[PDB]
Design brief:
This is part of a larger assembly, with three copies of chain A and two copies of chain B.
Chain A: E1 3-7, E2 10-11, E3 18-25, E4 33-39, E5 46-52, E6 59-61, E7 69-74, E8 79-84, E9 93-103, E10 106-112, E11 116-119
Parallel strand pairs in A: 2-11
Antiparallel strand pairs in A: 1-3, 3-8, 4-5, 4-9, 5-6, 7-8, 9-10, 9-11
Chain B: E1 5-9, E2 28-33
Antiparallel strand pairs in B: 1-2
Classes of the chains: A mainly beta, B mainly beta.
Protein name (chain B): Spike protein S1
Organism (chain B): Severe acute respiratory syndrome coronavirus 2 (2019-nCoV)
Chain lengths: ~120, ~50, ~50, ~120, ~120
């Protein structure tokens, strides 16, 4: 049974920074792509970023989160670290961590966690 | 060592003109200073004419 | 910025000059060099102590 | 090398007390001052309190928190303690533990930790 | 010296669930009743729930929390657990675990801890 657990959420006023982390357990994730998704209240879930665990790190971000959100992973601990920089109120949402495979060159989530709340307001 | 500077010294008369004597002598302690400096290079001072 | 200042014999008790010395102490990461005195008792011999 | 590790973070109600402790290792800090700083997200890290490791321990606090976030320390363990008391929502922030020296009578931090999120919300 | 230590507090979104924990040490608690009391800012102490350590577990709930909060205890660890379901902002309060004796058929607290946290907000 593959399980994902999130952590690092909370309240951060605009202009601050945060570090979100998710730990994956159950099986090896060498051939798995690890990424994050967020869903604000009253809005549909949206893809944030994903990164590959291969020796060559293939990394992606959504158009809105370019140059402001960073995603990294550690294959030794099967953990993914996500850096929030220059957060705005629009970033208030529940963030989830996903384990997926690379199908047809597209990140396809397979396992999901419970999610953590990241609120951005004064 | 560990923020302390230790100086040992010895003075003997010699009748040599070159190199160092083959005799054996121990250098007794002279002074110890409680200084946290980080000595890495040193230079000699001479009395020029 | 500067103003004249002085004292005279006719100045009142609160107007007389007073010498004030402030002994300030502060602790830094560097090794301590100043330390208060520290006692020594009398010497006894020929008995366990 | 010298490292500072925090512990005791979380979230507490307005009026509910808490305690954050940060242990300092590596060297001795009897000539130092054990202290804490807090950074409300989106703002500049504000002082909290500091305490000296002397027979006549000197303690400073921060205006907004004076007499509420009590601070103490230990010389043998080389640790700083911050007892937060009767909090309000305005106290939400990331609390950092600072190790410094008394220069010109002002607490001058030298070594800093990673911090911890202490939140106050209704 | 009987000591009570709380834990398990934190933040939860409206409609969520949480679980507080209190561990009691110092003496046997077979003849003791462990319960929880909560205080919201600007309000007095109001009873929440208590449970008995006898083989027939008598459990009492405050009507304001009836059918929403479940209280259980384990005599093996002398630890009382309080599970919250369908949490609402009204439930926000500092929860203090209490260990007492049954006098005149009414739970009479004898030992109190330092309290934990429960918040229900967006």
């Amino acid at each position: 049974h593959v399980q994902l657990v999130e952590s690092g959420g909370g309240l951060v006023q605009p202009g601050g920074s945060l570090r979100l982390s998710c730990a994956a357990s159950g099986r090896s994730f060498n051939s798995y792509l690890m990424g994050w998704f967020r869903q604000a209240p009253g809005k549909e879930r949206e893809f944030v970023a994903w990164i590959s665990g291969s020796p060559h790190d293939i990394i992606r971000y959504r158009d809105s989160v370019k140059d402001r959100f960073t995603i990294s992973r550690d294959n030794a601990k099967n953990t993914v670290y996500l850096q929030m920089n220059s957060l705005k109120p629009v970033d208030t949402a529940v963030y989830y961590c996903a384990v997926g495979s690379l199908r047809v060159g597209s990140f396809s989530p397979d396992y999901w966690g419970q999610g953590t709340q990241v609120t951005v307001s004064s | 060592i560990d923020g302390y500077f230790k100086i040992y010294s010895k003075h003997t008369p010699i009748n040599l003109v070159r190199d160092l004597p083959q005799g054996f002598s121990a250098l007794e302690p002279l002074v110890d200073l409680p200084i946290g400096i980080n000595i890495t290079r040193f230079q000699t001072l001479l009395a020029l004419h | 910025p500067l103003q004249s200042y002085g004292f005279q014999p006719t100045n009142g008790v609160g107007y007389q000059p007073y010498r004030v010395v402030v002994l300030s102490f502060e602790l830094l990461h560097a090794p301590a060099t100043v330390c208060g005195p520290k006692k020594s008792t009398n010497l006894v011999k020929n008995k366990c102590v």
